[PDB]
């Protein structure tokens, strides 16, 4: 019976809030409102969140504290035909760790590089600069903030493609190791530590968000940039590709499918109200994005006012924004060295809290399967991380971004989409909503309204399928800048996409064949829930 529980009600929330918050909130949320026509975008973002996004976020968290164990066992004890879903989900989380954790290493490298009176990346006259360089972002030229990030930090110019990684960059190496020594000692013992640690990582950004929020709005052109961000154009309401971006954001940002919320929620008490917790966690997430949206463009306007740069050049998503565009602006304003250290510190604490949930959903998932690795987490992770670290030297290499971008566009991209789809179907159909509700009434004391399951049973699959339909339509081969990825890399990427999903039909096939009796009555064995 007995399973370990959170230190406190807060330690749970903070973990989930921390986990669910990352640079996707910063660098894709602001850019969407901009290109999708401002606050108007918040309509489709709102609807997609309401019907599509949250119901899933709610479902993964409910199962978590109800079935009381890790992703595998949770899908084991629910619909054992589909127990493969548990497997798929976890190795996805396993995969991501080969790349995602690399970001915090860049942040700390910048952070470590931020100690000085005069910032390095403001200048076009340095050794790593080329005649193509300009002091700020310009059409047809390379910003000195970009040329710093590439020719010096990454050394990505020395890579001819993915085939050539080049030398391992060791300044990055010990930076990545520092991240794992942190992620280690955070997860090092139980949720007794990690639950407490998130109080920093899930909070500190909200602090730095503030003093950057004011510092950004005090600048000369800030009143302008906010107009760019929120200035409404309602023609987009009729644009298909707007609901795609919004629906994708709504879905990808909340984070179901990595088996984490399932994992975290497991340490919850059985009767803890997780409906309230689902709604509150969601809100903070979307809010935290909408806020940073204000934080970015106030700094963006200032560059378009004082620094005199075209908007279309500095309005950007992805790592280029936070590692190039933003720091470009900061170096200009007073107290430069201060703003840097808190920004990079914020980026770091933005990654850490998130990564924990992934590593945790892996460990917690296994601890409820293989007992003697529960006896020692304790050097289980030590292998895992050092395994991460050793492979993590691939991304620590000059062609690292090419590697990084590859796992990004492939690993969790279509893998997580189908993985969830079965979670919905298995729960809403195989397991049934009637018994899923009846579970939650025993938990929180009241069953979900006719609204929620309508999202689980119908809306969600129509919603997910809608994303992959327009996901394929807009498909192109993997490319970064002028570099087009070799089709073997593309194929190799689908393996990492397929190795996740392939678990589902694998375990489905295996078990029903590995079950005795009539083929019709060996299925009912796999339809019948563990509790029954």
């Amino acid at each position, epitope marked *: 019976d007995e399973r370990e529980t959170w230190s406190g009600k807060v330690d749970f929330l903070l973990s989930v809030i921390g986990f669910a918050v990352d640079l996707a909130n910063v660098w894709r949320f602001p850019y969407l409102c901009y290109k999708n026509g401002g606050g108007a975008f918040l309509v489709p973002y709102g609807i997609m969140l309401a019907v599509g996004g949250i119901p899933l976020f709610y479902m993964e968290l409910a199962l978590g504290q109800h079935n009381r164990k890790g992703a595998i066992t949770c899908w084991g004890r629910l619909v054992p035909l589909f127990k493969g879903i548990g497997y798929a989900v976890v190795l996805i989380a396993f995969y991501v760790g080969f790349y995602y954790n690399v970001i915090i290493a860049w942040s700390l490298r910048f952070f470590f590089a931020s100690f000085t009176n005069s910032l390095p990346w403001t200048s076009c006259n340095n050794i790593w600069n080329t005649p193509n360089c300009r002091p700020f972002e310009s059409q047809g030229f390379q910003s000195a903030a970009s040329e710093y990030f590439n020719r010096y930090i990454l050394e990505l110019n020395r890579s001819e493609g993915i085939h050539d990684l080049g030398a391992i960059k060791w300044d990055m190496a010990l930076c990545l190791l520092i991240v794992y020594l942190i992620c280690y000692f955070s997860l090092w013992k139980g949720i007794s530590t990690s639950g407490k640690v998130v109080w920093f990582t899930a909070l500190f950004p909200y602090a730095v968000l503030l003093i950057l929020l004011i510092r950004g709005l005090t600048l000369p052109g800030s009143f302008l940039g906010i107009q760019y961000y929120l200035t409404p154009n309602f023609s987009a309401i009729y644009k298909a590709e707007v609901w795609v971006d919004a629906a994708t954001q709504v879905f990808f940002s909340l984070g179901p499918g990595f088996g984490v919320l399932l994992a975290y929620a497991s340490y919850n008490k059985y009767h803890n109200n997780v409906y309230k917790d689902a709604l509150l966690t969601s809100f903070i997430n979307s809010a935290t994005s909408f806020i940073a949206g204000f934080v970015i463009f106030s700094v963006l306007g200032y560059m378009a006012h004082t620094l005199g740069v075209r908007i279309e050049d500095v309005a950007t998503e992805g790592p280029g924004l936070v590692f190039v565009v933003y720091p470009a602006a900061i170096a200009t304003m007073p107290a430069s060295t201060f703003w840097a250290l808190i920004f990079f510190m914020m980026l770091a604490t933005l990654g850490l809290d998130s990564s924990f949930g992934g590593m945790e959903a892996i460990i917690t998932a296994l601890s409820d399967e293989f007992p003697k690795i529960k006896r020692n987490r304790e050097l289980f992770v030590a292998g895992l991380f050092s395994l991460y670290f050793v492979v993590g030297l691939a991304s620590c290499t000059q062609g690292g971004f090419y590697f990084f971008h590859l796992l990004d566009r492939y690993a969790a991209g279509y893998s997580i989409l189908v993985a969830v789809f079965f979670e919905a179907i298995a729960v809403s159909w195989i397991y049934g909503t*009637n*018994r899923f*509700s*009846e579970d939650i*009434r*025993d938990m929180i*004391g*009241f*069953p979900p309204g006719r609204y929620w399951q309508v999202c689980w049973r119908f809306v969600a699959p129509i919603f997910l399928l809608f994303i992959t339909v327009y996901g394929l339509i807009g498909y192109e081969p993997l490319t970064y800048a002028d570099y087009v990825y070799p089709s073997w890399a593309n194929a190799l990427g689908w393996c990492i996409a397929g190795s996740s999903v392939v678990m589902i039909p694998a375990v489905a096939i295996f078990k029903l064949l590995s079950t005795p009796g009539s083929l019709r009555q060996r299925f009912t064995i796999l339809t019948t829930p563990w*509790r*029954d």
Partner: antibody
Amino acid sequence: EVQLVESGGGLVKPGGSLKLSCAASGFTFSSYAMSWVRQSPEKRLEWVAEISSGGRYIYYSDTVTGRFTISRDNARNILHLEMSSLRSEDTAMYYCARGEVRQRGFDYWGQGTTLTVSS
Amino acid sequence: ENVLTQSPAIMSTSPGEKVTMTCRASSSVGSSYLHWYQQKSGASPKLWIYSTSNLASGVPARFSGSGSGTSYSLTISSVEAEDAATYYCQQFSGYPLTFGSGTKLEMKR
């Protein structure tokens, strides 16, 4: 509109066994957890047992448990318990009462059915 | 078990007068989980007040309720004779579920 009707019950010799049944009508029965609540001649309401909608979750009183078993037929819309090893302290009027939502209490109550346990 | 004691047990009241009844519990109770039932003589109980404040349907608004923790009260602001009955409170905070001792209203004459 909504009616619940307990049937059965009557005189029973101590140690005897019996149970009654609530006939639910007017609402979708599968979606509401039911509960049995009894009231003695001292006119004091005591809880007996609750059963979930699909009936996978069942809660009993400790003055009862092991002598009482609660059952659910959703197909026919029927709720009945099962009583065995009765006592004279088990004498009361037994109420069929429903609520799904704990936060909302018991929405609708049966007309009651009497039970007298006597030598 | 969480035992709910209700006071006072019998209550004589002249019409229009204000009456209040108290319900006190052995253990702290979730504010929303408490409830109040009205039982007229020779008929099954009725749900009167659910949550703590919230009245049921057909329940005149002259009824109100308040309190938290181990302290709760049902208040009939003004009284008609139609209000003579026995009132019970209940907690869903946990199993086994529990009813108070009951408060019997009887009109003063």
